[PDB]
């Protein structure tokens, strides 16, 4: 039974759209598209609804040959029954999602870094790069790619 994954953070502008794009790219590279139904990204906030992702997230993806095309969208309560995994970037994301999640809904809310090996390659928390520089977006790329592979390796 295919699985559906939603990456959800705060603004659906920096990290979540990058995570959706990189994950799709790794799924394709691994030739496992058949195991998945939906792979999306949302934000708990409506601040960037309708907007294309941060130009720095777009640049970083393009620089790595990762396709990305998205418009900001806000989480909906039904998303907890729609997706098998609802993956946050940082702890504040989890706090908010856990407070919104209807009891008994199927979605397994978790931090992407939960798939970290803790082998020193990357840190567990995917920090919001918005107030930073392109190097923070670059490090996010590295973390998301790493957790993407770990996920495909552990969940399938
Ligand atoms: Cl959040």
UniProtKB/Swiss-Prot annotation:
Main location per the UniProt record: cytoplasm
Feature type site, description Important for catalytic activity: 16
GO cellular component terms listed in the entry, alphabetical order: cytoplasm; nucleus
What Pfam families does the annotation carry? Answer: LMWPc
Q: Tell me which EC number(s) this protein carries.
A: 3.1.3.48, 3.1.3.2
Report the residues modified as Phosphoserine.
52
Subcellular location per UniProt equals: Cytoplasm
Asked whether the UniProt record includes Cytoplasm among its keywords, one would answer yes
Instruction: Look up the further comments and give them.
Output: Present with 3500 molecules/cell in log phase SD medium.
Q: Which family does it belong to?
A: Belongs to the low molecular weight phosphotyrosine protein phosphatase family.
Please give the function described in this protein's UniProt entry: Acts on tyrosine phosphorylated proteins, low-MW aryl phosphates and natural and synthetic acyl phosphates.
Q: What is this protein called?
A: Low molecular weight phosphotyrosine protein phosphatase
The protein's gene is named LTP1
